[PDB]
Structures are given as C-alpha cells and as structure tokens.
UniProtKB/Swiss-Prot annotation, chain A:
Residues 4-93 form the Sm domain. The chain holds residues 4 to 132 of 196 of the full protein. GO terms for molecular function: RNA binding; snRNP binding. This is Small nuclear ribonucleoprotein-associated protein B. The lineage of its organism: Eukaryota, Fungi, Dikarya, Ascomycota, Saccharomycotina. The gene is SMB1. GO terms for biological process: 7-methylguanosine cap hypermethylation; mRNA 5'-splice site recognition; mRNA splicing, via spliceosome; spliceosomal complex assembly; spliceosomal snRNP assembly; U2-type prespliceosome assembly. C-terminal extension may function as a nuclear localization signal (NLS).
UniProtKB/Swiss-Prot annotation, chain B:
The chain holds residues 1 to 148 of 298 of the full protein. Coiled coil: none annotated. Signal peptide: none annotated. This is U1 small nuclear ribonucleoprotein A. It is found in: Nucleus. The lineage of its organism: Eukaryota, Fungi, Dikarya, Ascomycota, Saccharomycotina. Belongs to the RRM U1 A/B'' family. Present with 2950 molecules/cell in log phase SD medium. Involved in nuclear mRNA splicing. The principal role of the U1A is to help fold or maintain U1 RNA in an active configuration. It is the first snRNP to interact with pre-mRNA. This interaction is required for the subsequent binding of U2 snRNP and the U4/U6/U5 tri-snRNP.
RNA sequence: UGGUAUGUUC
RNA sequence: AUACUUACCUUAAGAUAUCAGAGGAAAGUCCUACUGAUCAAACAUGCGCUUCCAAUAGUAGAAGGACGUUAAGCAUUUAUCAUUGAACUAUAAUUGUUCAUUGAAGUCAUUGAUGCAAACUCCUUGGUCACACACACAUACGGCGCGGAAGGCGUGUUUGCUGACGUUUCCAUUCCCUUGUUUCAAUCAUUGGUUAAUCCCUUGAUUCCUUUGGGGAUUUUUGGGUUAAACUGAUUUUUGGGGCCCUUUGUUUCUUCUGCCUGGAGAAGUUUGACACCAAAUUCAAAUUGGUGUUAGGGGAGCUGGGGCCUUUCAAAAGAGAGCUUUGUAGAGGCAUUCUUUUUGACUACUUUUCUCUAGCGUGCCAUUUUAGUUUUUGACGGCAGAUUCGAAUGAACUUAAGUUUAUGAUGAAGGUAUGGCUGUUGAGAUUAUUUGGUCGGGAUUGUAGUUUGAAGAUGUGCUCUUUUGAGCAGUCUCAACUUUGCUCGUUCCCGUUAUGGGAAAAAUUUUGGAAGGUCUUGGUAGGAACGGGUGGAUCUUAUAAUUUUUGAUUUAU
C-alpha cells in the first residue's frame, strides 16, 4: 500500500491505522477521530502484543521468523495521546476516493435541506 | 539449452520480476527466491535462477502472445526431465493447468550456452532490421 | 437584551 | 403551542501566505479588483510514467481472517505462609522427612498454562472485462485493447483557509428516450448514395437538320434538379428464433399502485414536494407531535469548461544584416613616463660540482601525410557456395496436377547471405619507414653579469590629496554604445553587373504569442457573483517548559 506524501492525520479518516504505544503494544483499527493531544478513536481496533516467551525469537541471529502474537479484540475504543508513540497506515478505506466524494456531496445536500426545513418550521 | 514453451498461463501478474517469482513459486514452492521477496533476480546475459536445472524464464507483453512463456534450462536433458516431473499430471499455476512442450526453436540464451560449448548476434540483429522492414 | 431547564393553567 | 413560577448560566486574547519592488495616508505603521518571486489549496488536464485488478479449455486459485474443529494433539512445567504438638534422620538451636491442630491471606483454570507442528472445515474480499489458444527474446523481451484502484511527476486556470445565513433596486432560467440484455431473420416506415423510365439545366463524344451559329436524339457523359423501378448503408414499428442473466432472494431496489415464471408488464409521479419506517399517549385501528432515512442507474440533443492535432489571419524575433578600417561624441576600466644607485623579490645568460634519456651528432621523442608495409572495424558494398531469393510472368525437366530444380538473371527490389563462411574493391583507427618539420638538454648547488620590482635621487605637465619613490582627475592605453566612411561576406527581391557592389525587407522559411474555423476527446449541466455581520468550523501565534496528554522517571540499571 502506497500513501500520499502530503497526507496528515486529518486526511487519514477511515483508513486503517497501526498505532504503537509505549508498552510495546500495537492497536489496529479504522480511524474515526483525533485531537490536539493526539488521542485517537478507533473503530474495530484489535490489540496485539508479543509475549515475553515469544520475544527472544526476535533477537538477531530458519529463513522467516514466526511470532505467535497475543491479540485481544476490543471495539470502538478511544486511546490516550500520552501513550501513543507512532502511527503507521495498514489499509486503505472501503470506499474509493471518487465514491467518497459522491457520498459527501449527497450528505451536504440532505443536511442543507433539513436545516432549511427546520427554519421554515420554526417560523410557522 | 532447449527451452520449454508454456501456454495457458495467467496474464494479469504484469511486472516481469513479480511474474517470474510467482511462477517460480508455483513451479518449486519454498524456493530460495520465491520465499525471500526483495532479492534481486539474476540476469544471465550471453547464476542458476533455480536448482534442478532452471536457468531463466522469458515472457513478453506482446499482444500476439500473452499467456505463453519460455523457460530455458541448463542442458538438453533437463528439458526432457522436466516433463517427467509432471508424470502425465498437469501442473497448475493459479487455477489454470499449463500445457507445456519443447519449443519449435531453441532459446537465444540456450544458443549462447551451446555456442560457447557474436556473429550469431550479427545475424539476429540483421533479422530484426529485416523484420522492421 | 438572552439560553437551557423545571412544573402549573388553558 | 401560549403564558407564568423558579433554578442554573451569560465568554482567553490575537490573527488569515511569505519575501522583494513601485505608489499613497528621516523612523517605523497601514493600505494598494498594484506589480515580481516563492508557497499552499481547489478544479480541469496530461504523461509510451509505477504497482495491482481470480479456473470455466475449467470443479480451481490469491489475499486476509476464524474471538473454528481434530484436541485431554505431542513435549516440558506449576498448585500457599506462620504457630504448636508427635515420630524421624543428624555435624545441629533440632536444618531435612511424615501426621494432626490454630491463625492469615486465596482470579478462575490442571480437560489449564507454556513450547512445537500439522491436517481439515468454513467466512469476507476481486474486471471472475474484450480479443485471442498464438513460437518469443541481448539494447533481453512492441508497456501498440477498454476500464478501474492507488500513488509519483508536469502544465493550465482560479483562489489566498473554509462554510452556511441575510440583502441586491444582481445574474441565473433547458429538453428527450430508457430499467432484462444482446443477436439474427421475416416484415413496415424514414433517410442518404448510384443505376433505370419523363426528362430539364450545364457540358465531353457521336449522329441528323439547317446560314458562320443554333437545335433535336443517344451516351439518360461531366455534377445539380423532376421521379423513385433496382441495389446498398443508418434509424424505427410488429412478430418469431438463438445466446446469456434474473440471489432482482420484498423477482429490478427511484417511489406509489396494479401485477409476474407458459415472464422481464401496465398506470401515475419526481424536491420548498412525495414516499418508507421508528416512538409515544389518549384507554384497538385513524388522529397528531417528535425523529431517522430515500428521491436512483444508463444513453441522447442542446448549452458550456479543458486538452491534443490541423488550417487561415495578425504581431515580434531570427539577416541592410554581420565583420573590418576612418572621424567625432560619451560611458567604463587600468596606470602616467625616463635614467642612475642599492641589489629586497623574481626571471634570464655564463662558471664549478652532482645527477639524469645517450654527456653530445645520430639514434631516441613528438606532430601526422595515407606514399608504402602490417593490424583492426555488427565499417560499407558486390559476388559466390546452401536453391541467392522474390514481383510464380514465360520456357524446359522431374512430375496427373500441385510443388521443386534451372533459364530468360538485372527488367526492378531484397546488405551480401547465413541460423559454419570465403573472395575482391573502398572509408575510418593504430604503428613504423617515409612525403616532411620541431627537438637533444633538464633538475640540485654555487658566484658574477643584465632587466624589473622593495628603498633613495634627478626627473616627467597642471589641479585634488600628501612625509614620499608619490595615488586619482585633465594626460595616456584597452573595451563596448552612438555618428560618418569605403572594403569583405550574406536569408530573400530588384538594379549596376552576375567578378562584385548598391538598394529594400522577411513580403518565401522557422519559433514564440493572440483571433477565427475544422476534427478528435474529456468533464459539467442549477446554481453563481457582490456586499455584510455582536456567524459556525479548521489552521497559526501567545498565555503554556510547574501535578490531568507535547519540553522526559518504562533502554532495568547500582
């Protein structure tokens, strides 16, 4: 997967991130929101960690290393920004960029209609 | 030095380096090259690509001949031994079985191996200029 | 010059 | 809904791209539908850009899962602490071992946990597209079918963060088909192109009548018109046939209503509106109030934004130009000048010694003319051997014929031909002998001689400066610009003449910019501009490096 060179964390809404924390744990999920303190909200994020028993297979010396990774499933979590260490992008969004544009124009139309209605209703 | 000819290969891998490595995985799984990605492949111009005889693959994008490819081997005998590995059971790359047979014309790198066993290049380039006519 | 909230009356 | 009663609130500031240049209200400020350069955003638009997009010629496969099974898999390892009594081993207060008693805590698990590995089953995801079932390639591989996904880079236009809301005495302002699809045929209709019947105009040929000329007929000649008997292509109505699809699962999913498998259908509607659904309480339903959604997909006509390519027209670049000489002007740079002494620094010549190709002439070194030899060139050409072939035209032989061999074989192409090559001519490179030239001393050391600089004096013109041998300006030299002059060359035209000069200009060619038109493509099609504020949200700066996120107590440490 290739990510745009000028893509800040505001562009990467709905991409699937790979957040790394201080205790060596990786959180993987769809990005929903972020903040000034850099504390995310992740939709289907699944925590992974390397157990202390599997860890010495990572130490520098078969061809490929195989690390059984203890993963827990949690859903719609908010992380805290103090713990976050770095974020990487794993997967693109579901919808295409064109199709995302179509949805956004549609939603702008529907919202403007609803507030026009709410105004003309409060007048009568 | 005899190049095998393959029909009925998949034509969607695109990049030659990716195509050769994926094919070569389906040939000999847990090969040296196929299981380490981001190794350079040998370019052997007039280093075996794979042991048990495999020396190069050669594909083209030319819209006459999409699915066909040509594997050239070390010697005349390994070309016949490779058919023996199938033992009348068809090899399959992706979901399609690959019919295969020895080529009507030997490979150019195979001619280089047999000739070493440049005037030929002069003849071939003049052939190319005649075909450009 | 306001907002939200509350409960009563009709 | 109103109203009334209370209770709780009624705010961090500031900013909107940067740098430079011109202008306006000596330092700075502010501003400019000012101007350059950089940056950022949006929107168009391109790159021979880079990666990826699943069998049906088949019962597959790729990517990611399983919080799935085999499974108590196979191999290791774990399940308290204190007090007191009793036996007990013993070097021993009784350290070890076993049984019971009091107190204290105590995640569940032991079919667990941990290590290793394999088979199987199943979920989600995708162009399961079009043309192909193909002999490729060294410069390694036509990346030269249409789309889609994701990035990289470039150009153009607009903007200077971005959005709603109000005002305008602003501009705006469209239609049509279609909802299984595709294909073949029968048939209907429309339209164009040619031929044929009545022919006409125009005109090539013929023929006949007549006055040079004109007219009739045929070719219905050349194109157009009347007309539509024949053929051909594009659109459409009705019926039938073939293929594929229907999981479209609420049987097309734009909505409602009618409706369907021997079928794919009918009616009405399409945004200040309609439709579907959710929640309540009145004591079923309806009623209302409050909410969440839906209003689609494809094709066409106009209208319009963008690119590529072509035509025309206009302007500037390239050549009445270029160079050289003469005169004047003015700008810019550099410094005057001469000799003598001293011999600071530098160079040159000679003496002694040392070393070096040979200390010297030659040899040797260097330049290179192709005169000669040699060597080389995917150099080029021509021919030959494999059959030199091919425009297979023609003859003959083998042969039914076909095919093959050969000849007309240069009348024209194909480098020659070969997936070993030979032979001849010529161009380039290299070397030597030459056509010929130049060279035979250098480095270290040493004193003397000469020039020039560091210093002194006499000078050399005047001013500014100054202790001076003196630095700048009038003085002198070098270079460009303007003006005049003849000579030499030159893109195009003319003349004197085609020696060459004179005159004119791109009017012939190209590149750059703009206007118009053609062609191809790609996108849009109901909002848009201007003004405005006790308007929302982004970004930025400062409070803010002082316990609640970003100015360090998670490299396990001594």
């Amino acid at each position: 997967i290739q990510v745009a060179h000028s893509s800040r964390l505001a562009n990467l809404i709905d991409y699937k991130l790979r957040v790394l924390t201080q205790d060596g744990r990786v959180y993987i999920g769809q990005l929903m929101a972020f903040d000034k303190h850099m504390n995310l909200v992740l939709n289907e994020c699944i925590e992974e960690r390397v157990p202390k028993t599997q860890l010495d297979k990572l130490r520098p010396r078969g061809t490929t290393l195989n690390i059984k990774v203890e993963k827990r499933v949690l859903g719609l979590t908010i992380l805290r920004g103090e713990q976050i260490l770095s974020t990487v992008v794993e997967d693109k969004p579901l919808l295409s960029k064109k199709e995302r544009l179509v949805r956004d124009k549609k939603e702008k139309k529907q919202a403007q209609k609803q507030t026009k209605l709410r105004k003309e209703k409060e007048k009568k | 030095m005899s190049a095998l000819y393959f029909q009925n290969l998949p034509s969607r891998p695109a990049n030659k380096e990716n195509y050769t490595r994926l094919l070569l995985k389906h040939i000999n799984p847990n090969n040296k090259y196929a299981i380490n990605p981001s190794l350079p492949l040998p370019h052997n111009k007039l280093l075996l690509d794979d042991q048990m005889g495999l020396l190069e693959v050669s594909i083209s994008r030319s819209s006459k001949m999409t699915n066909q490819a040509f594997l050239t081997f070390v010697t005349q005998e390994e070309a016949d031994r490779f058919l023996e590995k199938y033992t009348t059971t068809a090899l399959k790359v992706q979901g399609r079985k690959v019919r295969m047979g020895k080529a009507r014309t030997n490979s150019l790198l195979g001619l280089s191996i047999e000739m070493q066993k440049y005037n030929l290049d002069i003849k071939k380039v003049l052939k190319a200029r005649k075909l450009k006519r």
